[PDB]
Amino acid sequence: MNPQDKAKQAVGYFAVDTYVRSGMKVGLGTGTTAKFVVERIGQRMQEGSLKDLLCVPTSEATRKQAESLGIPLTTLDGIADCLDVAIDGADEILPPTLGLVKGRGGALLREKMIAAAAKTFIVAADETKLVSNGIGSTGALPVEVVVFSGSHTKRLLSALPSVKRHGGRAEFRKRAGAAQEDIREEDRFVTDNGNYIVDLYFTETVPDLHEMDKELKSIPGVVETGFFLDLASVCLIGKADGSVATLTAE
Ligand SMILES: [Cl-]
Ligand SMILES: [Cl-]
């Protein structure tokens, strides 16, 4: 595998080895890094060191992967207390507050529901996910939006003061497939919750995340944002050489 994937693998395995134990209720992320987390839980099960485990997937792609490996699955409805731990990746990680940008794989809503329901929310990422001064340098800030009047909601997002200030441009997430100021409905990515996703790109770095998050949320039709603020408790960062750095809040 390439250097980036050895890093994603090392950090996923590490997360599972260090924080997951038998009898826990575990949240499972979505994406190429979470793939290795799921894969490691599957291995420890078969090896006999992980039992009586209840897991909650953040996407239908994640359940399908965990299903194919015999990992027990449910939703937050079937959990009485809180998840002990939730493990997921991130698209951007802003130390030292550990504010994140998530949602580039389309699963922001449930990832946030699962993260908020966990006593400890753990992010596992490779080194390229770390940013400085603010967000928006590696890509888009996703915003989940309802289907009805989606284009109009996209335009509203574009016009928010914080978004104009940072030179924001809006665009719909495309489904995997072929590809005027908007794309056609059949080409728009639909989340597991039946919603579209509006991606915001900026020409400059956005340093005030809390301010922007409130503005994005002031628009009716916005279901959820890619900002994960004051949620990550721990952020694991892996390198190709297999080592891992641990960032902790408080
Ligand atoms: Cl995602
Ligand atoms: Cl578009």
Author numbering: 1 to 179, 187 to 257
Provide the publication's sentences verbatim:
Toxoplasma gondii is one of the most significant parasites that impacts human health, with estimates that as many as one third to one half of the human population are infected. At the Center for Structural Genomics of Infectious Diseases (CSGID), the first Toxoplasma Structural Genomics Pipeline was established. The enzymes selected from the TDR database as small and tractable for expression and crystallization included: phosphoglycerate mutase II (hereafter referred to as PGM), nucleotide diphosphate kinase (NDK), ribulose phosphate 3-epimerase (RPE), ribose-5-phosphate isomerase (RPI), and ornithine aminotransferase (OAT). The genes encoding these enzymes were cloned, proteins expressed and purified, crystallized, and crystal structures were determined.
Ribose-5-phosphate isomerase is the enzyme in the pentose phosphate pathway just upstream of ribulose phosphate 3-epimerase, and it has similar functions, though it catalyzes the transition from ribose-5-phosphate to ribulose-5-phosphate. TgRPI has a larger α/β/α sandwich catalytic domain (residues 1–127 and residues 225–259) with the Rossmann topology and a smaller α/β sandwich oligomerization domain (residues 128–224). Residues 180–186 between strand β8 and a 310-helix (η3), Arg258, and Lys259 are absent in the structure due to their disorder. One D-malate molecule and two chloride ions were modeled to interpret additional electron density. D-malate makes hydrogen bonds with side chains of Lys8, Thr32, and Thr33, and several van der Waals contacts with residues of the phosphate-binding pocket of the active site (Schrödinger SiteMap score 0.97). CL 301/A is bound in the oxyanion hole of the active site and coordinated by main-chain nitrogen atoms of Gly105 and Ala107, side chain carboxyl group of Glu111, and two water molecules, HOH 415 and HOH 433. Applying crystal symmetry operations PISA predicted that TgRPI might exist as unstable dimer (BSA of ~2,430 Å2) or stable dimer (BSA of ~3,340 Å2) in the crystal environment. Homologous RPIs form similar stable dimers and, thus stable TgRPI dimer may be considered biologically relevant. Perhaps the most interesting feature of the determined crystal structure of TgRPI is the disordered region between residues 179–185 that comprises a part of what may appear to be an active site loop. These residues and 310-helix η3 are unique to TgRPI and might be important for catalysis.
